[PDB]
Design a binder for this molecule. Structure first.
Ligand SMILES: *[C@@H]1O[C@H](CO)[C@@H](O[C@@H]2O[C@H](CO)[C@@H](O)[C@H](O)[C@H]2NC(C)=O)[C@H](O)[C@H]1NC(C)=O
Ligand SMILES: *[C@@H]1O[C@H](CO)[C@@H](O[C@@H]2O[C@H](CO)[C@@H](O)[C@H](O)[C@H]2NC(C)=O)[C@H](O)[C@H]1NC(C)=O
Ligand SMILES: *[C@@H]1O[C@H](CO)[C@@H](O[C@@H]2O[C@H](CO)[C@@H](O)[C@H](O)[C@H]2NC(C)=O)[C@H](O)[C@H]1NC(C)=O
Ligand SMILES: *[C@@H]1O[C@H](CO)[C@@H](O)[C@H](O)[C@H]1NC(C)=O
Ligand SMILES: *[C@@H]1O[C@H](CO)[C@@H](O)[C@H](O)[C@H]1NC(C)=O
Ligand SMILES: *[C@@H]1O[C@H](CO)[C@@H](O)[C@H](O)[C@H]1NC(C)=O
Ligand SMILES: *[C@@H]1O[C@H](CO)[C@@H](O)[C@H](O)[C@H]1NC(C)=O
Ligand SMILES: *[C@@H]1O[C@H](CO)[C@@H](O)[C@H](O)[C@H]1NC(C)=O
Ligand SMILES: *[C@@H]1O[C@H](CO)[C@@H](O)[C@H](O)[C@H]1NC(C)=O
Ligand SMILES: *[C@@H]1O[C@H](CO)[C@@H](O)[C@H](O)[C@H]1NC(C)=O
Ligand SMILES: *[C@@H]1O[C@H](CO)[C@@H](O)[C@H](O)[C@H]1NC(C)=O
Ligand SMILES: *[C@@H]1O[C@H](CO)[C@@H](O)[C@H](O)[C@H]1NC(C)=O
Ligand SMILES: *[C@@H]1O[C@H](CO)[C@@H](O)[C@H](O)[C@H]1NC(C)=O
Ligand SMILES: *[C@@H]1O[C@H](CO)[C@@H](O)[C@H](O)[C@H]1NC(C)=O
Ligand SMILES: *[C@@H]1O[C@H](CO)[C@@H](O)[C@H](O)[C@H]1NC(C)=O
Lengths: 109, 123, 120, 120, 120, 123, 109, 123, 109
């Protein structure tokens, strides 16, 4: 699995960052580390794909990056509306195909 | 507007079987690869299986490799998963999702674009 | 034996003389036309065989299952109790069906191979 | 469809009719010369394709990267929104370059295979 | 270099120009006959390579061991100190023997592959 | 009428070698694949090796894979097994048997039809 | 290993069944589960092959079947002449080729 | 007369990187396969990597397989090794050597003929 | 690794041998077992290659052989000048390529 265990929080209007640490070859070799937003009882939606892209409908509030074997998601102008569980995932290189991280819950206050 | 709607599921005792299915609309069904993702009550997300757009190539996570079948019907716009030899560890919500691999001519994705709401499977 | 020496034998024994037959297929206007035609005939068989996914092989096999309607005649008691000349008549009305299927279940393989090689 | 039926369709769609086209390429002096020439032409394409490491395949990929200078008009732009007749003009001046690269990044492969097979 | 440019070079060096030579093998009755014959000759060599289990390759090795009676001349003595024109005379009386062995130790392989694919 | 008769065997000290053989009659030797099956004193049956009818393909149980050679001679109607680097765990009766894999033209068996009486090997 | 070690017995004239439990893919996926009759000091003979077939010379007294990943041999009009050890074996799928079970002894009286 | 001379090396903290190189003369550079051998203070000799004469085939020992790159330049008569993600266990003298695999036309060696003096790597 | 750690020694002018024990398939199957002479602080040099060959410049003082899965190096007219560490190595069969032994030190006195 990918590693991102702490709960995450910050003040409204302030940035917050959610890390996602991989192993080595999974996220070090691939640029396919997407992020999903999970509401507590709803299907998740795509926020980030590849490393830095976002689908239409997702604002600039959500962006991210990767270095070494660690990825991260940054939320900028943080809102109460962003209180969702977040997950990172990545391409495994055809043997397991996808690896999901454990997710984390975001609190804004 | 993507319409991925799961059905089937229910409570099946260990060693039994069931079939899940997902009907879909809005998007050309035949243009996309699809997968099933498991949401265990405490794991959140586990990838289970992937089928390509023509329904000829399938991939599985080791944990269901000898037990589950993923199948597609492009005339029906239906994705399905046949589960066999169910175990307690398979209790989860099973989501229909669009994405994963592509055709080699079309900007491979390796991420999921759309999700259904999920069928509930209890063993 | 020699060329066509196995013609009167069973399919089993005859399958071991394919090299012999193959080497004898390939080498004033009417004489020249005959030579040109022999080449065109040869090439059409090679093209067909190549399309089916069977190129530099005298023996090859595929994913098209044998249908029971195509002269279902056991296996072991017929393969070794029949000559190729007899077999050729037993299924003469099905070769076009079989050939069509052999091409379809190849084009599918080429697409699947192309997609698998595209997985990073 | 039939022969050239996909000529007006997209490159992607037309890639599924390669078999149809291939089978129609291969089947008093003026006519006899035309037949001989058609055979020589056919063989030259087969030889060339074989040199590149692509033998009986209708579709095959290699290790030569696409240069951006060779009309690299995106990817979906050409496979879904262009026909083969248009593509043939978009890169008409680069085919000799590409063919030379395809031959070179084959001879290198053959030497590597020959050496690997020599390890005990 | 160019066509036959490597003819005076050693076998090792000359083995790297095989592509050049292969491409120069392919393109009123007397002239037309010459063209038809060039095609028949070409096809015989291709048929032979296919029979030996070596199809779309310029270089391929097999399971036939070299017999020392076939003009043993060390190894580096041949590859780094002899031209192909000289080698051609060193073993001119053994080519038919070698070719027969190359065909036999192919038919053995095709049967073994056919049987292995029959296991479930 | 099948006649599979084993010979060879006897006591070999650990680390040594021996060769077993089986002569056969009644049935055309060249028409059948053959195997050796081991009967350890208290285990009953273990598959050891398989050879096809032309003598070109051989298969071994991993435990003898780097030590044993199986061979056929179709002119002699003889099956043989060359054992090297013998260990105490190899003490057993070794049976000559016909069956197992076949030619792909003949309704492959995957079972043994005939058995010899077995040579005794003591290490 | 296939499993069938407990001793088996029954009264003459009564049926008796000898089970053979496999693992998963061996007898589950391959219908190649033969049975052999072993006398104490003699070479064994084939009784059943594939799943339900018997070779000539074997009477109708011996028959069998397979379900799931378990196979069985049934003896009907049981005789004292059936006092032999029985073994099941099966095709393993080309990696180990054959698996023999831990067989069992049949007592009739 | 063989002249294999190593350079580079030095002290780099764990997780860092460095590049070693070896210049060579006397012998035709392009005629030989080359390798790097590690001499740890207590191990003596460990094989690390091998590259052929054309610079197209490379082989590595498992312990550096996901971290090190070996390359050659036949115009510069230079062999080099790029080390990444250095660990304390990689401290050793690294020797430049000629030998190992060959061309399949030239009596392959499988031994090392010439050695340089070695660069020192401390992590 | 190949094994040959015990110290080795002998009187000047007398022969001495150094063993090199492999496992099975490494030196049992491949006749590629070279030996190197390592002076304390100098690069090592080749003494023996294949099984019994010596490179030009190496005298007949050094010779060697192989039997079973064990190799050995023989030093005949032993000199004070032979005090060096000795190592055997072998071709691994393409999976690990080369195996070096745990070498030893020769004392002449
Ligand atoms: C074997 O061939 C038969 C025909 O020779 C196939 O059966 C036909 O399938 C079409 C499909 O719609 C039906 O309309 C025909 O009525 C069928 N005919 C008969 C006689 O059944 C059959 O499906 C083929 N089997 C396989 C396995 O491909
Ligand atoms: C892609 O093609 C361009 C040219 O179309 C190559 O660039 C040229 O490389 C030569 C090498 O000597 C230079 O002299 C030219 O000036 C370069 N041209 C340009 C426009 O820069 C380029 O190297 C090719 N890329 C690849 C990856 O092969
Ligand atoms: C190498 O070729 C020679 C002949 O050129 C083979 O030797 C002959 O083998 C036949 C077999 O029946 C004998 O009858 C001949 O008398 C042999 N000739 C000589 C000169 O001895 C030789 O066996 C071949 N080597 C291999 C390994 O096949
Ligand atoms: C002809 O038939 C007989 C019948 O037994 C057979 O033995 C013989 O080999 C056959 N001839 C050929 C060429 O197969
Ligand atoms: C069909 O094949 C089986 C295989 O044993 C054979 O026994 C049977 O006689 C054959 N039936 C025929 C030729 O009618
Ligand atoms: C097939 O068996 C019959 C049985 O008599 C025999 O007459 C016939 O010639 C055999 N066929 C061939 C091709 O040998
Ligand atoms: C082919 O069709 C004709 C139609 O009359 C029939 O007589 C003949 O037996 C058929 N051949 C086969 C192989 O069924
Ligand atoms: C011709 O263009 C139209 C435009 O939509 C398309 O639908 C049609 O399929 C095209 N014809 C072919 C042969 O693809
Ligand atoms: C390349 O194709 C993609 C497909 O959506 C398109 O979005 C992108 O804009 C294209 N590139 C350019 C430069 O237009
Ligand atoms: C590409 O898209 C344009 C959009 O109008 C369409 O007109 C054109 O025919 C398309 N090209 C092909 C080959 O269909
Ligand atoms: C090929 O060169 C000619 C020279 O004028 C140019 O006009 C044409 O556009 C070129 N074609 C391509 C594909 O660049
Ligand atoms: C001709 O022989 C000379 C002798 O030194 C050699 O250097 C030269 O390269 C040879 N020419 C060719 C074409 O190999
Ligand atoms: C023959 O091969 C050996 C292998 O070492 C070599 O030393 C010898 O010089 C070669 N003979 C010739 C004439 O080169
Ligand atoms: C091989 O070496 C000899 C040594 O005198 C030389 O004369 C001969 O020309 C060389 N052969 C080639 C092809 O260079
Ligand atoms: C081929 O046979 C002739 C017969 O006189 C002999 O002179 C010649 O040297 C032989 N060639 C070879 C390569 O042995």
């Amino acid at each position: 699995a990918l590693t991102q265990p702490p709960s995450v929080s910050g003040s409204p209007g302030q940035s917050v960052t959610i890390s996602c640490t991989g192993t080595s070859s999974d996220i070090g070799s691939y640029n396919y580390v997407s992020w999903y937003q999970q509401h507590p009882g709803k299907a998740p939606k795509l926020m980030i794909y590849d490393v830095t892209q976002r689908p239409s409908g997702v604002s600039d509030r959500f962006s991210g990056s990767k270095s070494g074997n660690t990825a991260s998601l940054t939320i900028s102008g943080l809102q109460a509306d962003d209180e969702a569980d977040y997950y990172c995932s990545a391409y495994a290189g055809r043997q397991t195909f996808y690896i999901f991280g454990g997710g984390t819950r975001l609190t804004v206050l | 507007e993507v319409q991925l709607v799961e059905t089937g599921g229910g409570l099946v005792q260990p060693g039994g079987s069931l079939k899940l299915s997902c009907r879909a609309s809005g998007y050309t069904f035949s243009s996309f690869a699809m997968s099933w993702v498991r949401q265990a009550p405490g794991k959140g997300l586990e990838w289970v299986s992937l089928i390509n757009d023509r329904g000829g190539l399938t991939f599985y996570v080791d944990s269901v490799k000898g037990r589950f079948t993923i199948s597609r019907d492009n005339s029906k716009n239906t994705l399905s998963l046949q589960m066999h030899s169910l175990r307690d560890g398979d209790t989860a919500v099973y989501y229909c999702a669009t994405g994963g691999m592509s055709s080699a001519l079309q900007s491979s994705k390796y991420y999921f674009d759309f999700w259904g709401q999920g069928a509930l499977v209890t063993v | 034996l020699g060329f066509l020496g196995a013609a009167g034998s069973t399919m089993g024994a005859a399958s071991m003389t394919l090299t012999v037959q193959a080497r004898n297929l390939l080498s004033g206007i009417k004489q020249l036309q005959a030579r040109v035609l022999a080449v065109e005939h040869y090439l059409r068989d090679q093209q067909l065989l190549g399309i089916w996914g069977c190129s530099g092989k005298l023996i090859c096999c595929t994913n098209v299952p044998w249908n029971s309607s195509w002269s279902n005649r056991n296996l072991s008691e017929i393969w070794d109790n029949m000559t190729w000349l007899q077999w050729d008549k037993e299924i003469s009305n099905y070769t076009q069906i079989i050939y069509g299927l052999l091409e379809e279940s190849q084009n599918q393989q080429e697409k699947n191979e192309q997609d698998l090689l595209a997985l990073d």
